Design a protein around this nucleic acid. Sequence first.
RNA 1: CCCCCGUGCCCAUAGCACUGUGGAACCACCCCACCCCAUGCCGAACUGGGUCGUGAAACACAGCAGCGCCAAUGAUACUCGGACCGCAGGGUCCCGGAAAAGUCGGUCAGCGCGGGGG
RNA 2: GGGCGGUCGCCUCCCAAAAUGUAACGGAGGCGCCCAAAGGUCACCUCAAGACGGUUGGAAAUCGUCUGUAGAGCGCAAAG
RNA 3: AUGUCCUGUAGAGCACUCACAAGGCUAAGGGCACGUAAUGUGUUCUAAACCUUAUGAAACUCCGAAGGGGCACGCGUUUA
Lengths: 86, 53, 178, 173, 111, 124
Amino acid sequence: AHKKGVGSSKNGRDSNPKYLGVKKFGGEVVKAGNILVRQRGTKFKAGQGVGMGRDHTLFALSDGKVVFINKGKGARFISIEAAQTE
Amino acid sequence: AKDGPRIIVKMESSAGTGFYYTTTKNRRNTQAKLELKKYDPVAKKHVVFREKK
Amino acid sequence: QQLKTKYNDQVRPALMQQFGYSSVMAVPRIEKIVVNEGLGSSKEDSKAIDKAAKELALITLQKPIITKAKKSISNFKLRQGMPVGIKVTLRGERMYVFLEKLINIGLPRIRDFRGINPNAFDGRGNYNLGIKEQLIFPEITYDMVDKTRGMDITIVTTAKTDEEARALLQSMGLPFRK
Amino acid sequence: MELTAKPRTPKQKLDESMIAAVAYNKENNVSFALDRKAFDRAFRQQSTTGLFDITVEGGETFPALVKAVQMDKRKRAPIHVDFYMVTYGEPVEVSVPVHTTGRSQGEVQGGLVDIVVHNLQIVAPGPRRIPQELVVDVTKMNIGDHITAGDIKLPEGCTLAADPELTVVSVLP
Amino acid sequence: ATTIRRKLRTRRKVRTTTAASGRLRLSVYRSSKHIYAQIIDDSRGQTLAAASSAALKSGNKTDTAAAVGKALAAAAAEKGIKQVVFDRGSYKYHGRVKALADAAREGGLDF
Amino acid sequence: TKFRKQFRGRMTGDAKGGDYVAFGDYGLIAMEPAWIKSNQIEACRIVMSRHFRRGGKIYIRIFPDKPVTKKPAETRMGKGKGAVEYWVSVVKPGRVMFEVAGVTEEQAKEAFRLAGHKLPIQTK
RNA sequence: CCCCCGUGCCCAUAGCACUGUGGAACCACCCCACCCCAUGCCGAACUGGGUCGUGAAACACAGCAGCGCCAAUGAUACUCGGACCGCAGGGUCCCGGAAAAGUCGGUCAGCGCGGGGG
RNA sequence: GGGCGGUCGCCUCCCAAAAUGUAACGGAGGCGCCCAAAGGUCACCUCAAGACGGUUGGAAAUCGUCUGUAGAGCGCAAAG
RNA sequence: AUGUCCUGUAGAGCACUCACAAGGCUAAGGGCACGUAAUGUGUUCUAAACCUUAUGAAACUCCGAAGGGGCACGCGUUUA
C-alpha cells in the first residue's frame, strides 16, 4: 500500500484478555491471566505481586500456571484446612 | 526476502553423516567462506559441521 | 614497621597526648589510599594511551585496569568499556615506607614548592590534593619517557571530624604547609 | 447560641435555614445542627479571638473557637464546614490569615493594592486555639525589605509543617 | 561487609527444602569460636536441640568444621538419623564448606 | 497561549468543579462552566483595564483549557480536522479580588460584561 | 525473673537523633601471612593461625515526639435504590455500604524457639 | 455520497461505559527483527543526579563522599 | 441471608508523568555597570528547582468502595 499526509488511512489492533478460573472455583490447572501469552508454572495461585495482597482463595487440586511477572502466581502447600490427605 | 550483497546473510552449515543444515543465520561480521563450528546434529552427539556451500 | 611504627607509637599516642578517646584503636588508621589520574584517552583513539597506562605503574608493578566512567556521553566520547580512569588498590606496610617516597620526594622540586596544602581539609580524612606532571624519581631512563600526568591524590584515613580529618595529618610526616 | 438537635441524617441539613454541624470531643461525637441567623460571626471578629460558651442541651460546657473559615463555594450559602473544640490529647488546620490594609505605598513606581488570593498559611499551633494578633503585609513596599512568611509575628512559639517558605503577601508592586 | 553484604543467600537457599522439602537446612556461622551445627528438617520448621563443647577444645577454622561433620552428625540427628540432606553454603567456599560436607557423609547423612 | 503543542484531544461534560478559595479581600466566582469564548477571555483583562490605572496587579485562579474542532461546512458528513475555536470552562473559582477601596469592583462590573451567564462577585 | 551467637510472625504502634554503660562467657578491631581459598591491584570487608590489648561511631539496653508511623461508629467527600428541584453536570428527602485529614493515644513491641551464669 | 487523495496485516492504549467489554475519513509509535549470545549455571556489584575541591581541564569528561518512594538500565512504541 | 478474594473508576490526594499559584532561597545561572589573571570585589532577575503556601486530570501514586463474578450452607415457584 501507500499513504501520505493530510489524510491517513491506517488500521488499529487489540487482543483477547480472557481471565479464566474465576477465583474460588475448584482448582485443577486451568490457566487465567493472559497478561503474557508465554505464561509460566504456578502450582497454586496465592495471588502475589508487589505490596501486600494475595487472593483469599485456598482450594487444592493441582498445578496452576498464571499471569506474568506483573502480579503473582502462588504454589502454596495448603488446601484450605486440609493437609493430611485429599 | 531481498538479494544483493548489502544487508542480510545467506549461510547455512554442513555436517557429514549428520544430515542437517542448521538452517539459521547471523552476518558477515566474522570471516567469509570459512566458518568453523561444532554443535549437535540429528542427535547422537555433535557430528562434523564445517560449512561450505 | 618503620614508619608504621612511627605511626603506631609516634603519630598515634600524640592524639591522646592532646585529648584521648575511648579506644586504643580509636585513632585514625590507613583507611583508603588509591591514586587517581588518567586524563581521558588523549593520545590516539585508545591504542597509544597504553604508553600512558603502564606509566601509571611508574614506581612499581600492579597492572592497573583504567576503569571507565559512565556511558551516556556520545558527545565528548565514552562507550561500553572506555578508559577515562584509574584507581587500583595497593596499600600495605611498605605503603608506610611508601610515604618515604611520598611524604618526602616531590617537595624537593615541584616548581615553587614551599608548603603542602593551605587548610582546606574538613569533613573526612580524604583531603583531595596532589600531582601536576612530575615524578621526582630517576630509577629508569626518564628520556625515553614522554607523557603528561595531571590530576591529584585522595587517600582517606577514617578521620571524619576535622580534628582528625586534619589533626594527625600535621605531625604526620614532616613535609607540609608550615 | 444554644444547641439541642440531633438528626443522624442529611435531612435537616438541606432544608432552608440550618447547617449540618460536626462534633468529636472526647467521648462526644454525633452530628447536631442549629439555625443560621447570626451564623456568620466567624470571620468577622471572633476568628479565634476570644472563646465564649454555648450551653448544650443537657451536659457540660465547651468553649472552643472557630476552626478557620469557609463560607460557601461560588454562592454564599455556607455548606457544612467544621468546628474545633479543645478536648483532644492530633488534627491540623490552623486559621492564621494575613490581610491587606492601608493606602498602598505603591505609587512610588507602579503597583496597586496588596493582592493575595490564597487561603492557606505556614502556621502549626500546638494544642488547638489559634490566637488573634498578627500583621505582615506592610513594611515599606520597595526593595531591601519585604515581608512574607517564614518567621514574622508568629502566634506563640515556633512553627511546624514541612518546609517553612510559602509566599503569601510579599511585595512586587 | 556482612550485615549489608550477607543477603545474597537466604530465601534463595530455602527453595529446595520448600520447593521439595526433601532436604534439610543448615545454620552455618562464622564466629571462629566453637563450631556447632544445629539443623532443622523442612522449611516449615525451625526448632530442634543440639549440644556444645565438652569434647575437644582448641579453636580453629579449617580443621574444626569437618569434625562436627561426623563428630556430631547423629548426636543431634535423632529423627530418622539420616534422610536426604543439603548444605547451606551461606558465604563462599574457603574449605569449611568442604571440610564439613566432605566429612559429613563420613559418619552419617545422605547427600 | 496555553499549551504550545503537546497533541490535540479533549472531550465534553458539564457539572461544577473544584477551585474555590477563601479570598482575602473581595472575591468573585463563576457558577458552573458558563460561556467565555477564549477570544472572549482574550478580552477579559484589557476590558478590566480600560484605565483602572497606570499600573496595578491582582490575582486570578484559572487558565485556558480548550480546543474544539469545528470543521468547515461544505458537507458535514465526516471525521474531524482541528480546534480553531478555543474555550476556558470553569466551576465557581476566584478570578479577581480587588485590594483598593472606593473602586470596590468597578472592574468586576464590566467583567459580567463579557458574560452571557451569571457570575456574581461575592466577597470574603 | 540473669545477660546472651540465633529461626520465624513480619513487613515503619522497631526511621533517625540525645544520655550512658557492658566486655571476662555473647560480639569489634587487631595480631602473624608463604602455603587451602589465589581478591578488576594488592589479600584490607573474599585469606591460614590466635592467649596481649580495648569496645571508641559501628555490638547492646531502657528513658527518650523534633517530624515521621497506627490513628477510629462520629459531620464531609463516594455509593445498589425510591418521587422529585432541575439545565447535562448539579440538587431535597427517604436512605444502606460507609475515604481522608483533623480528636486523643501510643512510638525504641511482643511469643515459642538452640545457651556462656549467682 | 462519485471519488483524485485517502484504505486495505499485525502490535500500545487514550476515549470503552472499574470482570469480558465494540466502533470510528477521531488520535497519536512502528514492524514481518536480534542474537553462537542481552541463552542455562554460579557469584559480586543500587543507577541517573547535586554537593568537596583539586587535571589538557574558560560548563561539561576525574575521583572521594551523603542523599537516592532507586528518579538507571534490562536489544527498537506501549502497557505490566 | 451469609462466608471468602479481587477488580481499583467515582473522589481524596500528590511525592516518580505533563503542566500550577505565592513566599524564603536559588543567578553551577545571565547580562545594564567607571572593571577586568577564573575576576578574587560587587550586583541585579523567572530560571532549574528544595521546603513551605499548598494547583489541576481520560490516559497520575502505599488509599477505597456500590456493583459483579466463584463456589458453599440451606428451599421458597418452576425443570431451572
